[PDB]
């Protein structure tokens, strides 16, 4: 129901072993930028390089941010994408470098694929089997504990390691409870009374859960996605409980802290260990920093160092500026807002302005997105105005035109409504004139 | 934080409760204990059988006869609403905990759903720390983790997909926008474009003046990129 | 407010009436410049009395608004 500024951007719209179609995925034109984004996306999917920088350079409205959104969608939600604005780096609780490093490590992702075998049942039989004592002593010995489990269209009786007794004691399973038991771990959890005994007592505080479906033995593969920043935050934070450390943590508000290099190296080491064990996979991801002009010179120098880091994502930067002094410098007039040192480490891609037909196609597709109907003459007038003042100006004037048409009980936009909106809402140029 | 305050989330909660004045409680204990309990309303009376955990909760709440109590059959939590008026005469001074309430009417077991209006900023603050609801008033909330905000967006989307939560977008009004800095405007340029961005109205009185944080004059003190995505009245 | 003259805690008329200690109302006698009065108090007020460590002869101060004993 919402209509954001980029809802039409469904993807880059390339074809296998080919190029960008003229109109596909909501984009129109900008073929070169889409092809460059496609090759960059393929490189990122290759997952074999680190610290590759691209700069979306172009005039305002030229689709820079739309192109970053296209990259994000093309990689999909499975690849961890971390949008960020250059203004966001200037925190008050920590230094800028800390925020940049946290974002850098936030962009990298880890995928853990674990398969587990589990039995899960209400409990029926519970009978230990006596066996001869190797040490004698006239004592009563058991060699297995026997459990019977019921499930929809399933039942089995299991002989278990006697050690289960201690688990069963701790869990305090009773007959008629629904329990979770791990095939290799010997761990047990109970979660339920079966709904079949919910009628035995009119009142009971515990929650009765439906009996498990399927065969009692079920094999499930669980996939989880995590980021290095999440891991660091979890490891840098107290567990949380009744101990005094948690008490002083509750007293003092948790502010951001400079996570030491030791913790980062420890996290990297444990991640490497578990990856070598074969359970986890690494996903680099993309960190898009819009309005890269807003970064200070110190942030640029740390990017200079951080791009050389052995583990870093692919950074996409956008800039709408021309020849302006780099922030944090007094007399360094440089192309875009990027200082020359960072320019040497990045790649620039151009985003061309738009023609009349391109503006018209963009306007008609945007109107299609907003569930509006427009006449051909109204479309021509709208495109003329967009070429007269601004494209985004027309794309914003679209909605009040629809409201004005609705006020006339009409389901289609007419030139009169367009002129009415033009009179009501002034553009940037006409306001500058006043 | 200002932007999220301008968006509200209307969330529905379904509650099932039993409320009534307990008439008689009889508990027998050896093995596990068993007992029977009777609860009446203004137009109903019923005898119930109590499980071990229900009896434990009753004992740990120290409920007596003539008290109006509420039990959530999902969790079994027992809350003492108050005492009857008939027991008021029994003392000269009353404790802080005591309360006098009438006996509830109607059926003993009732189903009720309640709609709650909570802003996104409030949800983020509540879900950030263990005591964020105090920071919702104190204002010492700090810079919430971005991963928390993304998770909250995902959760709100999940609720909306399941149909138990509704979004009520609002209007953000910024008085004297020329008091902002260039960094704030550069953030706003992208921030206006989020799917959950509200509708922002901006009021200014300065004409062609010098933008704060820059060394040049501007048509209204705002960068041209922001004016591009702004209609001027 | 006044000076405590008597403090005679009472249990319920039946042992089955309550839980554990089964302590019922407490009777307190206060003395002032204009006379004496015998009060009947809630067990919560008795708990407040125990918390404040009040003995016979101590001048006390009970707020019926909140049940706070000083």
């Amino acid at each position: 129901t919402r209509t954001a500024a980029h809802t039409h951007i469904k993807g880059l719209g390339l074809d296998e072993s080919g190029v960008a179609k003229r109109v596909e995925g909501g984009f129109v034109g900008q073929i070169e930028a889409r092809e460059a984004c496609g090759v960059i996306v393929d490189l990122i999917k290759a997952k074999k390089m680190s610290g590759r920088a691209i700069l979306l350079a172009g005039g305002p409205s030229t689709g820079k941010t739309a192109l970053a959104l296209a990259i994000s969608q093309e990689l999909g939600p499975k690849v961890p994408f971390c949008p960020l604005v250059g203004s966001e780096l200037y925190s008050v609780e920590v230094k800028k470098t800390e925020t940049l490093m946290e974002n850098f490590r936030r962009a990298i992702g880890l995928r853990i694929k674990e398969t587990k075998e589990v039995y899960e049942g209400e409990v029926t039989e519970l009978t230990p089997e006596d066996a001869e004592n190797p040490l004698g002593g006239y004592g009563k010995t058991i060699s297995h504990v026997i459990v019977g489990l019921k499930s929809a269209k399933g039942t089995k009786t299991l002989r278990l390691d006697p050690t289960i007794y201690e688990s069963i004691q701790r869990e305090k399973v009773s007959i008629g409870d629904v329990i979770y038991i791990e095939a290799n771990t010997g761990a047990v959890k109970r979660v339920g009374r079966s709904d079949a005994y919910a009628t035995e007592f009119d009142l009971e505080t515990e929650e009765y859960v439906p009996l498990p479906k399927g065969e009692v033995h079920k094999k499930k593969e669980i996939v989880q996605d995590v980021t290095l920043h999440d891991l660091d935050v979890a490891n840098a934070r107290p567990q949380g409980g009744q101990d005094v450390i948690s008490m002083m943590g509750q007293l003092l508000k948790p502010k951001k802290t400079e996570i030491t290099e030791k913790l980062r190296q420890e996290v990297n080491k444990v991640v490497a260990k578990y990856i070598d064990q074969g359970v986890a996979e690494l996903i680099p991801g993309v960190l898009f920093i819009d309005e890269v002009n807003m970064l200070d010179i110190e942030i640029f120098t740390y990017l200079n160092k951080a791009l050389e880091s052995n583990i870093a994502p692919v950074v996409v930067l956008a800039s709408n500026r021309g020849m302006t002094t780099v922030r944090g410098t007094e007399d360094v007039i440089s192309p875009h807002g990027v200082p020359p040192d960072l320019i040497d480490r990045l790649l620039i891609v151009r985003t061309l302005p738009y023609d009349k037909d391109e503006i018209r196609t963009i306007i008609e597709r945007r109107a299609t997105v907003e569930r509006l109907q427009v006449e051909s003459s109204a479309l021509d007038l709208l495109a003329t105005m967009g070429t007269e003042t601004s494209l985004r100006y027309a794309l914003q004037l679209l909605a009040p035109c629809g409201i004005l048409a609705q006020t006339s009980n009409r389901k289609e936009i007419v030139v009169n409504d367009v002129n009415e909106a033009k009179l009501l809402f002034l553009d940037a140029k006409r306001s500058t004139k006043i | 934080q200002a932007f999220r305050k301008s968006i509200g989330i209307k969330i529905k909660e379904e509650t099932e409760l039993i409320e009534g004045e307990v008439v008689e409680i009889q508990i027998d204990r050896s093995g596990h204990k068993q007992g029977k309990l009777t609860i009446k309303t203004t137009d109903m009376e019923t005898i119930y059988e109590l499980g071990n955990k229900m009896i434990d909760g009753l004992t740990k709440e120290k409920v007596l006869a003539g008290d109006v109590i509420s039990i959530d059959k999902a969790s079994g939590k027992i809350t003492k609403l108050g005492r009857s008026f008939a027991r008021s005469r029994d003392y000269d001074a009353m404790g802080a905990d005591t309360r006098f309430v009438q006996c509830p009417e109607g059926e003993l077991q009732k189903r009720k759903t309640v709609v709650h209006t909570v802003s996104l900023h409030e949800i983020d603050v509540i879900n950030s720390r263990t005591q964020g609801f105090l920071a919702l008033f104190t204002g010492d909330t700090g810079e919430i983790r971005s991963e928390v905000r993304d998770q909250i967006n995902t959760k709100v989307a999940e609720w909306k997909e399941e149909g138990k939560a509704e979004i009520v977008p609002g209007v953000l009004f910024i008085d004297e926008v020329h008091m902002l800095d260039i960094e704030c405007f550069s953030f706003i340029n992208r921030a206006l474009e989020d799917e959950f961005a509200p509708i922002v109205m901006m009021a200014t009185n300065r004409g062609v003046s010098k933008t704060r944080g820059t060394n040049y004059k501007s048509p209204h003190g705002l960068p041209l990129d922001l004016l591009d995505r702004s209609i001027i009245i | 407010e006044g000076e405590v003259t008597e403090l005679t805690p009472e249990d319920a008329e039946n042992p089955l009436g309550g839980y554990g200690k089964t302590i019922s109302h407490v009777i307190v006698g206060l003395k002032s410049a204009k006379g004496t009065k015998t009060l009947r108090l809630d067990p919560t007020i008795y708990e407040s009395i125990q918390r404040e460590k009040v003995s016979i002869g101590d001048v006390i101060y009970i707020e019926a608004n909140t049940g706070a004993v000083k």
């Binding site: 006239y138 004691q169 | 008439v23 009889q26 027998d28 050896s30 204990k33 006869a65 | -």
Partner: peptide, 28 residues
């Protein structure tokens, strides 16, 4: 048991796994 003696059978199974009124109240 320490003198190499077996325990009670019901106690054995209970340790392997792990009437009168007491409180009556009524409003007068």
């Amino acid at each position: 048991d320490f003198p190499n003696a077996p325990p009670n059978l019901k106690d054995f199974n209970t340790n392997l796994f792990g009437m009168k009124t007491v409180f009556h109240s009524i409003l007068p």
